[PDB]
Paper text:
Here, we report the discovery and characterization of a new FAD-dependent D-lactate dehydrogenase (PdG-D-LDH) from the gut microbiome of the isopod Porcellio dilatatus. PdG-D-LDH exhibits a strong catalytic preference toward D-lactate and preferentially reduces quinones over cytochrome c or molecular oxygen. X-ray crystallography revealed a VAO/PCMH-like fold with a solvent-accessible active site that harbors both a FAD cofactor and an Fe(II) ion. PdG-D-LDH exhibits the characteristic VAO/PCMH structural fold.
The crystal structure of the enzyme was solved both in the absence or presence of D-lactate (PdG-D-LDH–lactate), revealing a Cα root-mean-square deviation (RMSD) of 0.46 Å between the two structures. Moreover, a metal ion and the substrate D-lactate (in PdG-D-LDH-lactate complex) are clearly defined in the electron density. In D-LDH, D-lactate binds Fe(II) and interacts with H416, which likely abstracts a proton from the C2-OH, enabling hydride transfer to FAD’s N5. The C1 group coordinates iron and forms salt bridges with R323, while the C3 group engages in hydrophobic interactions with Y327, I369, and L380. In PdG-D-LDH, the C2-OH is 4.6 Å from FAD’s N5—too distant for efficient catalysis—unlike m-D-LDH, where this distance is 3.1 Å. Thus, the PdG-D-LDH–substrate complex likely lacks a catalytically competent geometry. The substrate-binding site comprises two distinct regions: one predominantly positively charged, defined by R323, H371, H378, and H416, is located near the C1-carboxyl and C2-hydroxyl groups of D-lactate. The other, more hydrophobic, is primarily delimited by Y327, I369, and L380, facilitating a stronger interaction with the substrate.
Numbering used by the authors:
A (entry chain A): 3 to 266, 271 to 460
B (entry chain E): 3 to 268, 272 to 283, 288 to 460
């Protein structure tokens, strides 16, 4: 009688059982991630509803997986058979914007882009800008510690989580973290929630840190290359010069030429960089970045004196994944290695394609060494699927061999549990099982993702 | 028979038992914090030695309390009777400075200022600059999540900790966190160590993120006031102008006197020292904010040296007051909008309890440091200050602040810490510590109670 207690606790408008409606609430954009039919999909109204849902599911031992917008790429939000999917679509209000403290308090259902537009009205700015910003929730960004494009100079979500309110344990609603500028009272439990991917609790309200709007001119330094190796050597060349570019992205040829077909290519690798320093200070730095592209392999390495053709190339970098998803199933990998390993990793990925006869596109946050190789899977050719799945295990192990990480921003979820286990090791994993057990003694919060419990 | 197992594990020259020597290892600069004679003070050489100390005490259930430079202000490093003090004095080497990744790898025993000067050679910079930087260890800065003067614009220690290696549990050497620029694999166990004050493990190596050197001329904006109330409104003026200053510090009268009566170098009640890191247009905007409020000799300083001399008194305020006797310090942090109100509350706590309370605070972040000098022989004033101590704290939580901003709960703040966190959150601390420290040997009893 799980659905019976839920309706009797939070009403009927907050429980859904139509197998047709629950279809889309149990899987995210991560393809090949298994997902089964959940027992019911709850859409709570406020923290009180979530507290009751967690309490009921805790006693009955029913797995509950929180869901934001369902734009994950590792199946972290995917629901298991009989689970209770908690959709925060109804908790989508920005509660306050304190201009003196320069902080904002939002609900987990808020959309990233919507949040940024609201704070910009008060002259503030929320730096984190994931490619899925137009559709991802702040709840998801906090659960997966999502990153963005400008995170090479302003950090990721974790760098802006001051405090939060979460439902944990048997249904206790607690307020973790702080709201002032400095606080060390107790443990960093608020930070412990960030990057947990909903395996330790449920965030019902988060307090974010803000910054003044950049109200300025973005000097773009555009560069083209003919090889992923040379272009990789240039990104490291700028980082060795000691420059902190406000953006440094790589878009191979296969990816950029596809976006044109959708929305309507000087070289093989397009290295897009940009700086945001005011006045000539930025122009001086943007010029320095240009030389780094020219000194290395340089094809059409020119600084952009146009505020739109620059912005048009960057809008293509954002529409790279959705432009290729319409082109068929797309398997994506997220590794992050040291900046000095970008050339070795780029040439190592390209080599991985020839060994398994699999064409692999490349886009990566060159500023942080976070590579995103994307493979478009042709339908009908199972060997290509199999060859790409084994190449999947080569790029991962190769990134761990140079000292990288199995995931940089997308989250372990399900499609990266193998690599995550090899990176963390038995001791680190054992600590995860212990931590999750103390804060989730019922084992109901998204059990089985990131790491396994046995 | 515990000391014997230790000596039989890490040699004799790494174990000390002389009760005359262990004194300097069993208590920190936090006075009135309880401390007893430890069973031995271990000075490890490498992670292997630290691993042995943890394994031995884990099986025997002997409490171990890690110690850095002993500059804590809440008794976090104070040792309990029969404990084993692990001193990282020997682990004080900078292991690597990766200029391509722009990161540094340090051991816990390294001093803050030493780490900064080291990275300065390679054109890098470590922003976090606590007042005790010249003699505090990086191991301590990570356990307490220390702050500094520039943290109003560059964050605190936790904002630069990329990864670490620690000995947890029964003595397993694990490396938490990452070393790249981005990493989200699993939980943030590294961030969990930060601010734990050594209650979940022992950090033997930390990987900190760095930034390019400033390489510019700072625009210092010095300002004088005649009261903590009027000056408080000036601090809000910079906040009401959308200005993020690289530094904003406030010092009281008795603080300045002690600095001029010690260093003998040198007029106002409070002195707000502002600074920008852009730039003259911003420094000028702040100057007008001071004259907008009660302004005495408010001038946007162009002499970078004379201003730099003024910032030496702000950092030498506590060392200049400890020479005048026992100094009990409180560390509250409230929202910026409560700085003026909170300052007026501190003054009343003095009049109400007949206690002279000096004030220095990072007004830019709302981190207040009211310090009382306790005279010798007048125990009445000591207990009277303890009552104003409970009043200034409750007023910090009532207005939405926190019991501790940068110093840490330790021991002299566990009362307020419990009131702030609450039963639910406290029950979580005992649960977390239990999972990662099933033996309960890592500084047990501090921060929260293991009742
Ligand atoms: C086209 C595209 C571009 C992308 N670009 C980026 C990018 O640039 N950077 C990046 O980091 N990621 C990117 N992603 C994936 C992205 O990380 C996720 O979309 C984003 O992190 C959040 O999406 P979401 O709102 O759907 O969260 P969801 O997928 O719903 O949830 C993700 C995780 O968070 C947990 N969770 C959700 N809500 C809550 C809550 N309220 N409380 C606690 N836990 C919760 C979920 O259970 C799951 O574990 C992209 C995805 C797509 C499809
Ligand atoms: C004069 C003065 C000025 C100060 N100014 C500031 C300031 O501006 N900002 C600020 O934030 N703080 C300040 N402090 C206190 C500051 O927190 C300490 O100076 C700093 O935290 C480190 O001191 P320490 O290295 O002696 O740490 P210790 O006191 O030795 O240790 C502090 C806590 O950390 C734990 N710990 C230490 N090393 C390890 C380790 N290797 N692994 C695990 N746990 C460990 C200790 O056990 C203890 O719990 C000041 C202190 C003084 C005395
Ligand atoms: Fe991305």
């Amino acid at each position: 009688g799980v659905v019976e207690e839920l309706v009797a606790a939070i009403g009927a408008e907050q429980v859904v059982t139509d197998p047709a409606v629950m279809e889309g609430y149990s899987h995210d954009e991560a393809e090949w991630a298994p997902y089964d039919a959940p027992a019911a999909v709850v859409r709570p109204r406020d923290t009180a509803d979530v507290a009751e849902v967690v309490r009921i599911c805790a006693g009955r031992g029913v797995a509950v997986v929180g869901r934001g917008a369902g734009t994950g790429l590792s199946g972290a939000a995917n629901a298991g058979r009989g689970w209770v999917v908690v959709s925060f679509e109804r908790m989508n209000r920005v509660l306050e914007v304190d201009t003196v403290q320069q902080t904002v308090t939002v609900q987990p259902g808020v959309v990233n882009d919507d949040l940024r537009a609201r704070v910009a009205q008060d002259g503030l700015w929320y730096p984190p800008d994931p490619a899925s910003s137009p559709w991802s929730t702040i709840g998801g960004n906090v659960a997966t510690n999502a990153g963005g494009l400008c995170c090479v100079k302003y950090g990721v979500t974790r760098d802006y989580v001051l405090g939060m309110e979460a439902v944990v344990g048997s249904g206790e609603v607690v307020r973790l973290g702080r709201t002032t500028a400095k606080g060390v009272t107790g443990y960093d439990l608020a930070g412990l929630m960030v990057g947990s991917e909903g395996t330790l609790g449920l965030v019902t309200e988060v307090t974010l840190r803000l910054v003044p709007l950049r109200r300025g001119v973005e000097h773009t330094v555009v560069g083209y290359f003919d090889s992923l190796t040379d272009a990789g050597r240039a990104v490291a060349a700028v980082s060795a010069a000691g420059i902190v570019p406000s953006a440094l992205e790589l878009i191979d040829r296969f990816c950029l030429q596809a976006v044109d077909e959708w929305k309507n290519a000087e070289g093989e690798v397009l290295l897009l960089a940009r700086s945001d320093l005011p006045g000539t200070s930025g122009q001086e730095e943007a010029d320095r970045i240009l030389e780094c592209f020219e000194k290395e392999k340089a094809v059409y390495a020119v600084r952009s004196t146009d505020e739109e053709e620059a912005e048009a190339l960057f809008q293509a970098r954002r529409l790279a994944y959705p432009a290729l998803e319409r082109l068929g199933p797309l398997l994506t990998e997220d590794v992050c290695v040291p900046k000095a390993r970008v050339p070795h990793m780029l040439e190592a990925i390209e080599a991985a394609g020839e060994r398994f006869d699999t064409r692999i596109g490349n886009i990566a946050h060159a500023g942080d060494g976070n590579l995103h190789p994307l493979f478009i899977v042709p339908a009908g050719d199972e060997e290509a699927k199999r060859r790409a799945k084994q190449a999947f295990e080569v790029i991962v192990d190769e990134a761990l061999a140079v000292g990288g990480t199995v995931t940089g921003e997308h989250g372990v979820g399900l499609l990266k549990m193998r690599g995550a286990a090899d990176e963390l090791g038995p001791h680190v994993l054992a600590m995860h099982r212990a931590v999750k057990g103390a804060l989730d003694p019922a084992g109901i919060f998204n059990p089985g993702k990131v790491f396994a419990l046995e």
